[PDB]
Amino acid sequence: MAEKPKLHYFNARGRMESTRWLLAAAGVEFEEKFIKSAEDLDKLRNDGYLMFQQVPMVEIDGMKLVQTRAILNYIASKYNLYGKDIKERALIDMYIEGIADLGEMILLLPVCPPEEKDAKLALIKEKIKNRYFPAFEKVLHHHGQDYLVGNKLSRADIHLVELLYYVEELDSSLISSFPLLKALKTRISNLPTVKKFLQPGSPRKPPMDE
Amino acid sequence: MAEKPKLHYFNARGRMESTRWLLAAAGVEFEEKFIKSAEDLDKLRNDGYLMFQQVPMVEIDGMKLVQTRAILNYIASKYNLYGKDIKERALIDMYIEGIADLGEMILLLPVCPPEEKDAKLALIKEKIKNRYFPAFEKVLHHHGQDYLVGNKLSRADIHLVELLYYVEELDSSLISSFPLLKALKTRISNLPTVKKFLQPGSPRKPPMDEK
Known part of the structure; x- marks a missing residue:
């Protein structure tokens, strides 16, 4: 079946x-x-x-x-990747909808004409450096734990690390001032299923x- | 607190x-x-x-x-407006993400210039009549029950009826061929909290x- x-x-x-x-x-x-x-x-x-x-x-x-x-x-x-209760789900949902907003910007980045591609890419990089990466670094800094929510792997870690791989494709330097994001990227990438x-x-x- | x-x-x-x-x-x-x-x-x-x-x-x-x-x-x-289990939530989520897609089209409808407003409204009306309203009318027709999911009030009924009021503001005739949606609108609108x-x-x- x-x-x-x-x-x-x-x-x-x-x-x-x-x-x-x-x-x-x-x-x-x-x-x-x-x-x-x-x-x-x-x-x-x-x-x-x-x-x-x-x-x-x-x-x-x-x-x-x-x-x-x-x-x-x-x-x-x-x-069992959506948190243990509805308050953990609320944090997961808030985090991953922010991830979705940035992901949509990247998905819909124009290729043509070149001056439009360049202008939109500049704005995305500004938002990555000044809005999205600081927000997620702050979550990780505030609780000091290895995962975004509940001290356990969740979809929020998976969706974020996926996005980190796309941001690396745009500009590998954008993550450089965010050491906890770099560490999360490494930790999630070493899980055997993700590897x-x-x-x-x-x-x-x-x-x-x- | x-x-x-x-x-x-x-x-x-x-x-x-x-x-x-x-x-x-x-x-x-x-x-x-x-x-x-x-x-x-x-x-x-x-x-x-x-x-x-x-x-x-x-x-x-x-x-x-x-x-x-x-x-x-x-x-x-x-x-307790999100169904009773994971499968009911899957149905609710399906339905209300379609509602969100149509709601976003309405939210972002331009007002200016008039020919552009008219053009994009014509596209929205075609999707209401051919894509979204048939989809929700089929859900209600298939199980014959008063609510979208689980035979019990959920957020899907609330979100859908909200959107029915916005479609009414655009064109009161678009719902006319969907009797189960009209009956749902009346039923939810008569719930004391919603009324x-x-x-x-x-x-x-x-x-x-x-405003």
Whole structure:
């Protein structure tokens, strides 16, 4: 009756990559079904597989889940990565929605024309240095613990470290004045499930033009 | 301590209105502290009240919560409006993230120039009639029950009916072919907590072209 979740998306990062990270960190093997044409997406739509006619969609535990946050919230709860109580979940949600805001800026960074790419990249770097990285460094500095919330691995650590890898692709110097973020990146990357995902041949997807 | 949540935002709907709806529907009295100037927002920032230097912020249960979804998820769980288990939450989350997508289109609808307002409104109406309203009408039709999930009031019913009022403001005819959505709107609007919120004098905020 099927055990591997099935990920319906493109052979690309896009809006599915944070789900790939979370499942891989939880040690969950999954299947991917790549959209490669208009007819592939039209088939999913006509078959009634997409509640709002869009992907990402994940087949898991008998459901056809769409909307990235619905998918991620279910996976996080199922694999005990969403905190131990609703107050831990509140901190996790606050942290990861800030991460989502920065991640969306990076996802939608224009490539063309060059003067627009340059202008938007400059603003993103300002926000990374002055808003987002200080906020997360401060959480880690305030409790001195190895993880963001509850002194235990959660999805917040996984989502943040994923973002740290994208920020490194934009500008490797941006993390340099944030030693607790660098230490978190190292600690999470050394977890055996995450280290496997970082190896060649994993489902981790490459950048578009980096 | 401080039994009433405190909502920090502008005296406007914006990104705080769905929290006002949810707290009011849950029967929870709250306080508001309105940002009326740049100085107000700067004071919140320099006092360390805003994790990412932005509002909405809600003071609740000893936390200074920012990010609308963090605020709403916590309130929904605290007041037992988030279903009974992980699978019900998956359905709720699916539904309300679709609601959030349509709500965002409406929130960001331009007013100017008129031909652009008209063009993007025409796109929103086509998605309401062809994508979003059919999807929620099918949910109610499939199980035949009074509420979206679990045969019991949840945040999904509250968030959907809120959005039904905004769609009504855009075009009162868009719901006409969706009888189950109309019946849900009437049912939720007649719940005593929601009916009270719909009265003049409640914390419900007006549309911007009126304030």
